[PDB]
Nucleic acid binder design. Structure first.
Ligand SMILES: [Zn+2]
Ligand SMILES: [Zn+2]
Ligand SMILES: [Zn+2]
Ligand SMILES: [Zn+2]
Ligand SMILES: [Zn+2]
Ligand SMILES: [Zn+2]
Ligand SMILES: [Zn+2]
Ligand SMILES: [Zn+2]
Lengths: 81, 79, 81, 79
DNA sequence: TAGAACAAAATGTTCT
DNA sequence: AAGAACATTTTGTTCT
DNA sequence: TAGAACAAAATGTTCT
DNA sequence: AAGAACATTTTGTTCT
């Protein structure tokens, strides 16, 4: 494919285990390494697309996790082999 | 009463016709003057409070307008 | 510019401090991290271009050093600032 | 005498007409059959020895030909 | 592919 | 009340 | 930009 | 002597 699985923007490649765009890559990195005590202003199912992905970091981060992103994807796939 | 009518933060006074905080005051001026077009990612009914107000500029802006904010609120001292 | 300063092939970017192609980048990395007890079969001035860069690793590595390549270029340029 | 005439490594016998090592033997067959065109990076006079022979296929190949290597050296038992 | 560094966008505060 | 300036936070791009 | 991992090219050894 | 097969070393590319 070539859609980011988090926001549907065009994927820049496979990051942290999942096809994503560059903005979602660095978003997940920052969320995972820091705090991500984010608060949804809707019902925890906000739509995350190219334009709206800035709206709700709580839902964007939930979508990163649901897509399967994980910081150790590279080293984990090396073990699996 | 010291409570922003848009986000319930502590209000700094009457801005553009409405009791608001400083952050909502300037957010509103920017929204109108930049005339940007925001889009809600929920259901057009997001909770707008001191922290969540950052999440949905579309609903925050809508609440400003609904609360009566108007850049020429003062100039409307017409007789 | 856009010539590799080591072999004159097209540069892929600035690596280890110097504009180089990808083949020269990984060549220098391997030479620096391992042994580079290479022996020139000419007079230590072999010509290193796209086709001949495979011929003499001793001279190719000398050219990497002469161009200024160094493993810590990134962290070194951070200190300088 | 057990010394490769191309690289002075220890020779394994007469290959393609010339006393050579195994590595020079197969290098020569590959050069001729792949018919590749090598280029020297020095002065067409590189030192070819057990270790340096890897550096200049052009001079190594030239030395093979000059030493008399020929893939049909055996078949040249013509009367 | 992962990540540093730079850049930009978006928001908030101070001060007049 | 209103706004400019600065500051911070949040997000996105380049890596010549 | 740095680097892991994969891939290819180039060389050398064994075995018949 | 000659060569195929395998093995190793050296070099280069992709990273869906
Ligand atoms: Zn994305
Ligand atoms: Zn949400
Ligand atoms: Zn407010
Ligand atoms: Zn909303
Ligand atoms: Zn190069
Ligand atoms: Zn040389
Ligand atoms: Zn030899
Ligand atoms: Zn030569």
């Amino acid at each position: 494919s070539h859609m980011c699985l988090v926001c549907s923007d065009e994927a820049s490649g496979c990051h942290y285990g999942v096809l994503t765009c560059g903005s979602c890559k660095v978003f997940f990195k920052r969320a995972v390494e820091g705090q991500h005590n984010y608060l949804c202003a809707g019902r925890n199912d906000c739509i995350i697309d190219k334009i709206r992905r800035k709206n709700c970091p709580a839902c964007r981060y939930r979508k990163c996790l649901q897509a399967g992103m994980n910081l150790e994807a590279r080293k984990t796939k090396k073990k699996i082999k």
